[PDB]
């Protein structure tokens, strides 16, 4: 038996493990602490080492020896990295031309750790949590990255996993990885265009994916390293400052530990109020020896966060314009990440888009899953498909001659009754491809119009004529557009009852 | 889904220039999806490997069947695809295996790539692939034998002059393959006794047809459906079955009742 293969979503704020059971479904591997999305944090208390939400607990108490958000510093030198992102955690220093961190071990001795060392020992117990649940050793994994990591980072992730003995067998982009599990659980009845939304704690990722006969392709991607759940969190930090200084006449912002425990207890409400209408905060010894008790509902939270949430809908708008699409054309918006649990962010997207876009989120009655989980579950699905392959076959499958498919830029289709353009094979379609349209109610003699199509900001405008075909005294017809590997367009129009078929060739 | 222009000009002439790759674009895609792992596999793996052979088709009897889709395969005739258009239902199980071994080397996709053929013939190969498991299954072949309208010989035309034993001769074996009862009474000749005629029509009046219609299911139960959707398709699919059972049985009754008067 080959080694088990698992999927890794490595995130700024959370990491998750997925694995395909012998019952051939997805199962989420949890940590020993019982939380599925393991946080990406390490805290050293002397010689002892802590991970996860346990390691996030010492951030308020020992912030100089607690590290966080170490995904964006991998593979690139320190001068291209913003140090103030981990200004709340451990300082990031200059180590060997890349980013390193200053830690303190037992007896006050100082150890200088590379960020390459960080990912290895983070994956050390991501290995341990996976093999304890499954009961067998793991050696290889599929790692999901954002699409803006270059190849020199991917080799560094391959190298740092090789420091501990993990073989990163494949790299896949997170919008491509997250969508597959949604497509496996809920297959699409029609070929659609969808937008993957990854709203993390410290960064926001949006990418536009065309779903064409099971092939997932980039139209355009967008990233914002400044928009995220931290801005949701920091807006509440100044919010909780407001009632505290009017009631108790103290400034909680001027103490780092007071601001950290305020930042810690505000971080819980982002998860807590995603499922309930209100949340309560009780903090012993906040600042100047003062306790604090307050209850905050959904509506005043949304009244606070309407500036940031409008930026989140604005970030959706820019990636559509970057690929030059119209929000009438887009079929769905797919959501992943812990920010996507918020029901306010769900409601903004039906308002700022047409009603024909179905927003795939936690609130959806028909197509819903866990947004923090949906990235990793797609990686295990790719893991199961490649589990039959050795390294030679998958690397040959990874070759640019094979992974590059030519597509079709300008869409084709059928002309309507009033001269409107009805696309059959849409835009952005790879070939060879064949689609069937059943005109069952078609009675009489028909002229079948094949035209190229032009799209503008959305009505379809009739474009360049491809061919024309006609049928006589027909009672139900099928229209077939066939494109081969050579780009030749062949159109078959078959009568549904008599079998009288007229074939067009180009 | 909307209406059609419905024009009476009825032209079947292409007027534009040849299809260029200027509206064709070529950036790569991400290696993800189960259909990536098959679309790559056709250009990566592409794995493919006597008195009874005199009964086969030497050349493909339906030339249009080569261009037919693998997805639209249920309207495709598998007997013309297998090379058994002469014999159809009466071919044995080993004959299907020998016919499958003939057609796998004639239409080898690597040899089709060697002969310069397109990938459209590989779509006909997926017809050739799953025809084998359909025709080696006892149920699935019999289900395909239940819908073989090409082998369904019609009764002869009304108002014409014909021999009764020669024109209705091959007709009654078309449903005798659907007989659950053995032995099969024969039509006989002009010198047949009255008791044999009474034993004939009673067999056809009390006829037992095993013909089913699961292959005519346009909607099939998907495994991605929930519990009510697999039930909802089945009652509709049964409603197609018994209607086509009773109508063909009434057609068979009219097949019985016309031969009595003629």
Residue numbers in the entry:
A (entry chain B): 1 to 457, 490 to 538
B (entry chain A): 1 to 49, 70 to 282
Paper text:
Ribosome associated complex (RAC), an obligate heterodimer of HSP40 and HSP70 (Zuo1 and Ssz1 in yeast), is conserved in eukaryotes and functions as co-chaperone for another HSP70 (Ssb1/2 in yeast) to facilitate co-translational folding of nascent polypeptides. On the other hand, low-resolution cryo-EM structures of the 80S-RAC complexes and biochemical characterization have identified the contact sites of RAC near the PTE of the ribosome, and more importantly demonstrated the separate binding of the C- and N-terminal parts of Zuo1 to the 40S and 60S subunits, respectively. Structural analyses indicate that RAC on the nascent-chain-free ribosome is in an autoinhibited conformation, and in the presence of a nascent chain at the peptide tunnel exit (PTE), RAC undergoes large-scale structural remodeling to make Zuo1 J-Domain more accessible to Ssb. Our data also suggest a role of Zuo1 in orienting Ssb-SBD proximal to the PTE for easy capture of the substrate.
Except for a disordered region of Zuo1 (residues 50–70) and a highly flexible β-hairpin of Ssz1 (residues 458–488), the cryo-EM map has well resolved densities for all rest parts of Zuo1-NTD and Ssz1. In this specific conformation, in addition to the previously characterized interactions of Zuo1 ND with Ssz1, two new inter-molecular contact sites were identified. The first involves the first helix of Zuo1 ND (residues 33–44), which is sandwiched between the HPD-containing helix of Zuo1 JD and the IA subdomain of Ssz1 NBD. The second is between the surface of Ssz1 SBD (R521, K534) with the N-terminal sequence of Zuo1 JD (E83, D89), through polar interactions. Very importantly, this conformation of Ssz1 is stabilized by a previously unrecognized interaction of a sequence on the IIB subdomain of Ssz1 NBD with uL24 and the H7-loop of the 25S rRNA. Secondly, in the State C2 of the RNC-RAC complex, Ssz1 undergoes a very large rotation to flip to the opposite side of Zuo1. In this conformation, Ssz1 sits exactly above the PTE, placing its SBD close to the exit.
